[PDB]
Amino acid sequence: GQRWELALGRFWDYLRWVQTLSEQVQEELLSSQVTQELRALMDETMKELKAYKSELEEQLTPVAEETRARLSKELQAAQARLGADMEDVCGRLVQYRGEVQAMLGQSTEELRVRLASHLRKLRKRLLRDADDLQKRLAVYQAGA
């Protein structure tokens, strides 16, 4: 099932737009609008993913509790790793907003060079934990 993949696709596209640090992105960065819109997207992905795991617990093949429950603890953790990535990205954008206030009108060009470099790394990490969680979810899609 892929309702949570679509909701993550929307998170991921928005963040790809933020990564460009265009005029409008910078505007909405110094206000609380992109961390407010990324929270809403995160929240729909996690909502939809909790409900997909819930419905997959209905179509599980014959695995004994020390293995079927080893697997949900490993899957709740990949859900948790992905949530923690998205929160990390929003905290790095809050940090940028603060660091622009503290410049007191001075050039933020060197600040946007470090942000773009840092955001790319976070987004690299985010994408590999979504891929990992899809794998654990696909092995669980049938049981073990």
Swiss-Prot record:
Phenotype when changing R39T: Changes the plasma lipoprotein distribution of ApoE4 to the HDL
Question: What, per the annotation, is the impact of changing R114S?
Answer: In HLPP3; ApoE2 Christchurch; decreased binding to LDL receptor
Residue numbers bearing the Phosphoserine modification: S107
Could you say what the effect of mutating D132A is?
Restores the LDL receptor binding activity of ApoE2
For this protein, what post-translational modification is recorded in UniProt? APOE exists as multiple glycosylated and sialylated glycoforms within cells and in plasma. The extent of glycosylation and sialylation are tissue and context specific. Plasma APOE undergoes desialylation and is less glycosylated and sialylated than the cellular form. Glycosylation is not required for proper expression and secretion. O-glycosylated with core 1 or possibly core 8 glycans. Glycated in plasma VLDL of normal subjects, and of hyperglycemic diabetic patients at a higher level (2-3 fold).
Give, from the UniProt record, the effect of changing L127A: Increased binding to LDL receptor
Positions of the UniProt region annotated as LDL and other lipoprotein receptors binding: 118-128
The organism's superkingdom is given as: Eukaryota
Q: Which residues bind heparin?
A: L122, R123, K124, R125
| Positions annotated as glycosylated | K53
Outcome when changing R3C: In LPG; ApoE2 Kyoto
| Effect upon mutating L122P | Decreased binding to LDL receptor
Q: In which tissues is it expressed?
A: Produced by several tissues and cell types and mainly found associated with lipid particles in the plasma, the interstitial fluid and lymph. Mainly synthesized by liver hepatocytes. Significant quantities are also produced in brain, mainly by astrocytes and glial cells in the cerebral cortex, but also by neurons in frontal cortex and hippocampus. It is also expressed by cells of the peripheral nervous system. Also expressed by adrenal gland, testis, ovary, skin, kidney, spleen and adipose tissue and macrophages in various tissues.
Where are the sequence-type repeats located?
A: 40-61, 62-83, 84-105, 106-127, 128-144
Report the disease annotation for this entry: Hyperlipoproteinemia 3: A disorder characterized by the accumulation of intermediate-density lipoprotein particles (IDL or broad-beta-lipoprotein) rich in cholesterol. Clinical features include xanthomas, yellowish lipid deposits in the palmar crease, or less specific on tendons and on elbows. The disorder rarely manifests before the third decade in men. In women, it is usually expressed only after the menopause. Alzheimer disease 2: A late-onset form of Alzheimer disease. Alzheimer disease is a neurodegenerative disorder characterized by progressive dementia, loss of cognitive abilities, and deposition of fibrillar amyloid proteins as intraneuronal neurofibrillary tangles, extracellular amyloid plaques and vascular amyloid deposits. The major constituents of these plaques are neurotoxic amyloid-beta protein 40 and amyloid-beta protein 42, that are produced by the proteolysis of the transmembrane APP protein.
Q: What does this protein do?
A: APOE is an apolipoprotein, a protein associating with lipid particles, that mainly functions in lipoprotein-mediated lipid transport between organs via the plasma and interstitial fluids. APOE is a core component of plasma lipoproteins and is involved in their production, conversion and clearance. Apolipoproteins are amphipathic molecules that interact both with lipids of the lipoprotein particle core and the aqueous environment of the plasma. (Microbial infection) Through its interaction with HCV envelope glycoprotein E2, participates in the attachment of HCV to HSPGs and other receptors (LDLr, VLDLr, and SR-B1) on the cell surface and to the assembly, maturation and infectivity of HCV viral particles. This interaction is probably promoted via the up-regulation of cellular autophagy by the virus.
So what family is this one in?
Belongs to the apolipoprotein A1/A4/E family.
Name under which the protein is recorded? Apolipoprotein E
Which species expresses this protein natively? Homo sapiens (Human)
Where the shown chain sits in the full protein?
41 to 184 of 317
